[PDB]
Amino acid sequence: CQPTRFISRHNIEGIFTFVDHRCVATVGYQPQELLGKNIVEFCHPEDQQLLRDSFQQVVKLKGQVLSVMFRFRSKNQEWLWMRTSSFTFQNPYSDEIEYIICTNTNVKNS
Task: Report the nearest approach of other proteins to the CB of residue 60 (Å).
Answer: 21
Dist CA 5 CA 105 (whole Å): 4
Instruction: Choose between 36 and 63: whose C-beta lies nearer to other proteins.
Output: 36
Taking 3-state DSSP, the helix, strand and coil percentages for the chain, each rounded to the nearest 5, stand at 20, 35, 40
Identity (one letter) of the amino acid at 55? F
How do strand 5-10 and strand 66-73 relate by DSSP bridges? unpaired
Instruction: Choose between 14 and 88: whose C-beta lies nearer to other proteins.
Output: 14
Task: Report the nearest approach of other proteins to the CB of residue 15 (Å).
Answer: 9
Dist CA 22 CA 98 (whole Å): 24
Binding residues for other proteins (CB under 8 A) = 36-38, 40-41, 43, 45, 48, 73, 77, 79
Instruction: Choose between 64 and 77: whose C-beta lies nearer to other proteins.
Output: 77
Task: Report the nearest approach of other proteins to the CB of residue 1 (Å).
Answer: 28
Task: Report the nearest approach of other proteins to the CB of residue 22 (Å).
Answer: 22
Dist CA 50 CA 71 (whole Å): 11
